[PDB]
Design a protein around this ligand. Structure first.
Ligand SMILES: N#Cc1ccc(Nc2nc(N)nc(Cc3c(Cl)ccc4[nH]ccc34)n2)cc1
Lengths: 543, 425
């Protein structure tokens, strides 16, 4: 449909040649079924009859719509694709609705017969060769070649979108009042011109397009909102996720829990407090696809609350550059955090969650910063600027943590927001030992094979305890020991540990881990008034 | 002024870079947009189509914070994919004594390259993309038409031109060592600073009246307290804070700690036995308890304070290997750092700090201790190290640019376990 359209020169991967995949014979009904689609096709110049020895062929296959209102031509370019150069990946990133700027009118455009409107590099034309059979050797097979973009080739979407961009560009510039967004075959136009003009301007666009062989049976701006796109319900001034369904089942299998978590994560964009720890905690699937897995107790409760949340429709608003971009986070609990980003008080821009990806240890302050981190990157992609954070932490707690933290961090501008839970250090270990405090030379190992060990201790004051454990590891006992030491000690204690392992676990001052031992030790640390763990080399170290 | 291009061929079985462009602030998109628009005019870069799948990243840094930004192309991937075969087919020899000069100043000559046209074929491999906020749009795409800054093939192909422009200067002044690493010239002299400074602007203007513009016009006769001559002093490069404390009294803990540090010195200097100190701890005594000494204990201390004050050997620089640069937060704007190639075979340890307080954050610091440690590397061994940055990847990945000033980018990774390797240093 276009000589005025400039073709994008295409090439075959470095040392390869054009596809050669002979055509299987098809039903005679189809031969003409294609012959109809093809002569009216060659007629439209989209394709062209080709003479002998274009050694390259590709499979054609008349396909029934299954609604049989008419027939459809379909080519299998798999082999051509496998032989054509890479192109500039389009849509590698997709816009988030929460980042679209508040606009009045927005009208989509089903730019129809698009791939067949854009020309195709003359030279790359010879590989598009496909042959339609003539009823079992009756003739030299009706053989065609493509002059437009083959509807299923590799560089088609790209070359299309490229070409489009070039076509709009003129018009696009003759109108900074209109902004346009291309999406494959779609073309969403938006503006702030009184709806009367905007409808007059789309008329224009449309005509502009039209002069470029690009048609749009979509006149009046046919299709209306809410627009369905990449799974979003997009209304004039609001947006949301295309309704989801969390099925209720008797037995849950892996492929089942996965689409569930997927649906749940996805709804998290705008549905506040959606948790997913438990539902996933299950998926440490030694990836057995239909391995039937029984929802655990919490997973059953977790999914519950998600329903309570999901049932009730929640929407998200758009972006007004002229207003701030605020972000708030609130701790759920089992390493889970949730956040919503907003400009106004009641309607959100978007929401989301964050959880410390499985690693048996971490602190709330650490977790909160990782959260803040993810939000920052999200903000930069969506709005192009960091937001103002409102966080459940007090300058004193925060700044005291980043100062003692060995890793470097960057805390953008934030405000305190008193609204529990509260992020805080439930205990600080003593930097220098404690004078007078009974030192506990805590120790405890095990027999790697026998899975048996003992954790005990010996203090200055000649106090010695030794407890036996069955079914634990050197690691397990090393904390078992420390713990022990805390139990027996008074409210101030000095503990000498031989294991960095035990050291670090506690030194990071983790505030949690479902690892009941550390919990016990942690709970004990909070109770004391002065604790000092000090590390000393193992083997050689002491006696 | 068309010049004959110099054919660039990547190592066989190597295809061009396809790295993804980091998302940017609208601010920076805005700047890059302006900058590229201008380069497009000057004809330096050109818009490209979809038949170009390649992409190296671009950022926007603040030159010398003035009204404008500079565009910074991270050609790290395209470099490995080339310059490594152009560290060969065009190697730029490294002066093993530039580290000896009393003063080294660094001037940005990168802008020279911009005249020399880029091999018509290799261009496609340089394509970069100005991103769009919230993807509402297809990145803006350009590819280079002239030698570009950041890509090591530029100093390699300009090398010809450079050694000539500098020849009738390297004469008058035959004692100054000039080294060209990428877009920067490292001039080294043994002059009293005052003269050096002059000698440099002597050079600054030499280049200038022959074409090469060098923005190293840091300031004017007005002192608003801006930071002085990128004058490094590699004759003062040294270090021995392998400092044990010389205390009045020694407690059970003190030694304990001590006996500890001394144990990791074990793979750095397999020379110090502690049985003599450590034996003074075979007991389960208090910790706050002060306990003077033992036998060769003091000898084991005064004797260790010695071998530890005398650097190790076998520690030689292998050019085949890479330089690995570990850093660490030390607290109160202090950061210690090692440069090695094999564990505990330090080629050079060190330290950095800014002025601690109400103006500097960690990232900016890190971002600095890195450009510091880097430069040092370049000066000493003509090659940047691979930094093992103690920081969360994403955080660093968002801000590094903020305080970044070098026209180059080392290679880095992120550690998340820095042991009390912080203690020992
Ligand atoms: N800032 C900004 C900004 C962002 C987008 C537009 N243009 C625009 N706004 C809306 N509300 N809908 C549309 C159409 C549109 C749909 Cl149907 C679905 C997902 C989308 N992503 C992308 C555009 C877009 N375009 C204009 C300005």
């Amino acid at each position: 449909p276009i000589s005025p359209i400039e073709t994008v020169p295409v090439k075959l991967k470095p040392g390869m040649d054009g596809p050669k995949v002979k055509q299987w014979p098809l039903t005679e009904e189809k031969i003409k079924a294609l012959v109809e689609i093809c002569t009216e096709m060659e007629k439209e110049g989209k394709i062209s009859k080709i003479g002998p020895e274009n050694p390259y062929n590709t499979p054609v296959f008349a396909i029934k719509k299954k609604d049989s209102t008419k027939w459809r031509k379909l080519v299998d370019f798999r082999e051509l694709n496998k032989r054509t150069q890479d192109f500039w990946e389009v849509q590698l990133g997709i816009p988030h609705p929460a980042g679209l700027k508040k606009k009045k009118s927005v009208t989509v455009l089903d730019v129809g017969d698009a791939y067949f409107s854009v020309p195709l590099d003359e030279d790359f034309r010879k590989y598009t060769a496909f042959t339609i059979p003539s009823i079992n050797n009756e003739t030299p097979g009706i053989r065609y070649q493509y002059n437009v973009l083959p509807q299923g080739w590799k560089g088609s979407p790209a070359i299309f979108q490229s070409s489009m961009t070039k076509i709009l560009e003129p018009f696009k510039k003759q109108n900074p009042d209109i902004v346009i967004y291309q999406y494959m075959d779609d073309l969403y136009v938006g503006s702030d011109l009184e709806i009367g003009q905007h409808r007059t301007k789309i008329e224009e666009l449309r005509q502009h397009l039209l002069r470029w062989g690009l048609t749009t049976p979509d006149k009046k701006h046919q299709k209306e909102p809410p627009f369905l796109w990449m799974g979003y319900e997009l209304h004039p001034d609001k947006w949301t996720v295309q309704p989801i369904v969390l099925p209720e089942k008797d037995s849950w299998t892996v492929n089942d829990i996965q689409k569930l978590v997927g649906k749940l994560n996805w709804a998290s964009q705008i549905y506040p407090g959606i948790k997913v720890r438990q539902l996933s905690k299950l998926l440490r699937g030694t990836k057995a696809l239909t391995e039937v897995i029984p929802l655990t107790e919490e997973a059953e409760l977790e999914l519950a609350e998600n329903r309570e949340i999901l049932k009730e429709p929640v929407h998200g608003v758009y972006y007004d550059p002229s207003k701030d971009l605020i972000a708030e986070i609130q701790k759920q609990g089992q390493g889970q955090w949730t956040y919503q980003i907003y400009q106004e008080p009641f309607k959100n821009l978007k929401t989301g969650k964050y959880a410390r990806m499985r690693g048996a240890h971490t602190n709330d302050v650490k977790q909160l910063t990782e959260a803040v981190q993810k939000i920052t990157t999200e903000s930069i992609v969506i709005w192009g600027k960091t937001p103002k954070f409102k966080l459940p932490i007090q300058k004193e707690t925060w700044e005291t943590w980043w100062t003692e933290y060995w890793q470097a961090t960057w805390i953008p501008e934030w405000e305190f927001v008193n609204t529990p839970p509260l992020v805080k250090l439930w205990y600080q270990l003593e930097k220098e030992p404690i004078v007078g405090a009974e030192t506990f030379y805590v120790d405890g190992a095990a027999n790697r094979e026998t899975k048996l060990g003992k954790a005990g201790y010996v203090t200055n004051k000649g106090r010695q305890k030794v407890v036996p454990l069955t079914n634990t590891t050197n690691q397990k006992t090393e904390l078992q020991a420390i713990y022990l030491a805390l139990q027996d000690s008074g409210l101030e204690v000095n503990i000498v540990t031989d294991s960095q392992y035990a050291l670090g676990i506690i030194q990071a001052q983790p505030d949690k881990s479902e690892s009941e031992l550390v919990n016990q030790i942690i709970e004990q640390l909070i109770k004391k008034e002065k604790v000092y763990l000090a590390w000393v080399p193992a083997h050689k170290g002491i006696g | 002024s068309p010049i004959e291009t110099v054919p660039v061929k990547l190592k066989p079985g190597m295809d061009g870079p396809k790295v993804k462009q980091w998302p940017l602030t609208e601010e920076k998109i805005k700047a890059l947009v302006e900058i590229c628009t201008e380069m497009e005019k000057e004809g330096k870069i050109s818009k490209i189509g979809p038949e170009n799948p390649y992409n190296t990243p671009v950022f926007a840094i603040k030159k010398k914070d003035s009204t404008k930004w500079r565009k910074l192309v991270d050609f790290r991937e395209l470099n490995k994919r080339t310059q490594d075969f152009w560290e060969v087919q065009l190697g730029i020899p490294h002066p093993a004594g530039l580290k000896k000069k009393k003063s080294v100043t660094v001037l940005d000559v990168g802008d020279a390259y911009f005249s020399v046209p880029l091999d018509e074929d290799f261009r496609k491999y340089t394509a970069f993309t100005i991103p769009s906020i919230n993807n509402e749009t297809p990145g803006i795409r350009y590819q280079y038409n002239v030698l570009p800054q950041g890509w090591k093939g530029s100093p390699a192909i300009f090398q010809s031109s450079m050694t000539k422009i500098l020849e009738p200067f390297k004469k008058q002044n035959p004692d100054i060592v000039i080294y060209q690493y990428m877009d920067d010239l490292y001039v080294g002299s043994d002059l009293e600073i005052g003269q050096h400074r002059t000698k440099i602007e002597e050079l600054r203007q030499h280049l200038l009246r022959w074409g090469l513009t060098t923005p190293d016009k840091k300031h004017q006769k007005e002192p608003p307290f801006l930071w002085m001559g990128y004058e490094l002093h590699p004759d003062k490069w040294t270090v021995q804070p392998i400092v044990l404390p010389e205390k009045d009294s020694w407690t059970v803990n003190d030694i304990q700690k001590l006996v500890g540090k001394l144990n990791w010195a074990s793979q750095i200097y397999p020379g110090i036995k502690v049985r003599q100190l450590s034996k003074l701890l075979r007991g389960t005594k208090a910790l706050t308890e002060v306990i003077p000494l033992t036998e060769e204990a003091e000898l084991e201390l005064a004797e260790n304070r010695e071998i530890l004050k005398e650097p190790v050997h076998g520690v030689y620089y292998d050019p085949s290997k890479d330089l690995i640069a570990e850093i660490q937060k030390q607290g109160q704007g202090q950061w210690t750092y090692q440069i090695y190639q094999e564990p505990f075979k330090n080629l050079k340890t060190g330290k950095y700090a800014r002025m601690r307080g109400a103006h500097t954050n960690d990232v900016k610091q890190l971002t600095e201790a890195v450009q510091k440690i880097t430069t040092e590397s370049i000066v000493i061994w003509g090659k940047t190290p691979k930094f093992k940055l103690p920081i969360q990847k994403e955080t660093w990945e968002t801000w590094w640019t903020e305080y970044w000033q070098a026209t180059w980018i080392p290679e880095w990774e992120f550690v998340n376990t820095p042991p009390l390797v912080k203690l020992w240093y």
